Design a protein around this ligand. Structure first.
Ligand SMILES: Nc1ncnc2c1ncn2[C@@H]1O[C@H](COP(=O)(O)OP(=O)(O)O)[C@@H](O)[C@H]1O
Ligand SMILES: Nc1ncnc2c1ncn2[C@@H]1O[C@H](COP(=O)(O)O)[C@@H](O)[C@H]1O
Ligand SMILES: [Mg+2]
Lengths: 82, 256
């Protein structure tokens, strides 16, 4: 529940920047992680289902975020209405 | 047959390879003089990665698999610091190394590998075993060049994973059909189809099933790989439909 909730706040912010939007974060519904190997490295992805307000109306989104905790790295892969 | 195994049952020869958790050695059982491989795993490095749980499952599954295209686990024993796995020896090494050596495989060698893999996987699926992680480094070659599948929150290696896994959805045995598609392409081409300079790009290409073929890949091969690499798992062929695909029957060799 802690670092996750932050991650969600970060996903919403990155969406707002990429799409010129003004979504307001509400809460995390669900959250998963998986790790992948690529070449000689390892990357985690978080799968977050979040509620956020679009023009006042609460909606459900799924974000996928890359996280390499070691190098203080995070990056929005995708952000979609459910 | 044999009540129990011990290190004293084996003459040991050269190292065959260094794995993550110990080394693999050439070995020979003393009574029969049959040549085998002995894989030594250090318990400490197994704890230190909590792989132990998987080893248990590996050993128990691979114990009950009997297939010409799956590497036999004949038996096992342990001591204070080590686990020992008594394995079928694969003298011609990994497919990974052969592909590095040759760059890419002709249609006959590929189609043969794909037949052997599809037969192995069909048997597995019938035993409710899904591999989920077939890539060239987990495929070994027997004395007649026959393929042997070796290995039974880390999901896998990105380049080999299907859309349903990378996108965190539910998945089932159809994942191995995707893998077969990737492998067939990699065998023919020399690299997997979604390879990219970033993992971000690889992720996107897989999720959108965006790949193309070089111009030497034939119509038959393209037809098979394109059926295997379907976004929707439901639309991917059954393994028995791979085994009867026209490109497979025209090109595959029959077991020695
Ligand atoms: N049964 C075998 N016959 C021949 N060589 C083998 C056999 N098992 C493993 N090897 C060799 O030793 C290496 C050890 O790898 P592997 O057994 O997969 O260990 P890990 O998966 O822990 O890295 C392989 O890459 C291969 O070259
Ligand atoms: N550390 C270990 N790693 C793998 N297998 C083990 C280990 N210790 C015992 N085993 C055997 O692995 C199998 C799993 O337990 P079981 O089959 O219930 O006896 C058995 O053959 C065990 O005795
Ligand atoms: Mg391996």
């Amino acid at each position: 529940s802690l670092e996750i909730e932050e991650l969600a706040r970060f996903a919403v912010d990155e969406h707002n920047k990429k799409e010129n939007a003004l979504l307001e974060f509400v809460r995390v519904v669900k959250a998963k992680e998986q790790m992948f190997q690529w070449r000689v490295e390892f990357i985690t992805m978080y799968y977050l289902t979040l509620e956020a307000k679009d023009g006042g109306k609460k909606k459900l989104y799924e974000a996928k975020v890359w996280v390499k905790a070691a190098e203080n790295f995070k990056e929005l892969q995708e952000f979609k209405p459910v | 047959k044999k009540r129990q195994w011990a290190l004293e049952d084996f003459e040991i020869g050269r190292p065959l390879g260094k794995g993550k958790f110990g080394n693999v050695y050439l070995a020979r059982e003393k009574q029969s003089k049959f040549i085998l491989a002995l894989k030594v795993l250090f318990k400490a490095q197994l704890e230190k990665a909590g792989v132990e749980h998987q080893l248990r499952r590996e050993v128990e599954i691979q114990s009950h698999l009997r297939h010409p295209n799956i590497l036999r686990l004949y038996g096992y024993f342990h001591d204070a610091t080590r686990v020992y796995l008594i394995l079928e020896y694969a003298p011609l090494g990994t497919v990974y190394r052969e592909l590095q050596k040759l760059s890419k495989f002709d249609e006959q060698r590929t189609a043969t590998y794909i037949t052997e893999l599809a037969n192995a996987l069909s048997y597995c699926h019938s035993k409710r075993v899904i591999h989920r992680d077939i890539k060239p480094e987990n495929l070994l070659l027997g004395s007649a060049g026959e393929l042997k599948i070796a290995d039974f929150t880390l999901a896998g290696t990105l380049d080999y994973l299907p859309p349903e896994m990378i996108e965190g959805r539910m998945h089932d045995e159809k994942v191995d059909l995707w893998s077969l598609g990737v492998l067939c392409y990699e065998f023919l081409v020399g690299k997997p189809p979604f390879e990219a300079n970033t993992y971000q790009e690889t992720y996107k290409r897989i999720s959108r099933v965006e790949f193309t073929f070089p111009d030497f890949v034939t119509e038959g091969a393209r037809d098979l790989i394109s059926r295997l690499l379907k976004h929707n798992p439901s639309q991917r062929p059954m393994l028995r439909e791979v085994l009867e695909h026209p490109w497979i029957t025209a090109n595959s060799s029959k077991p020695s």
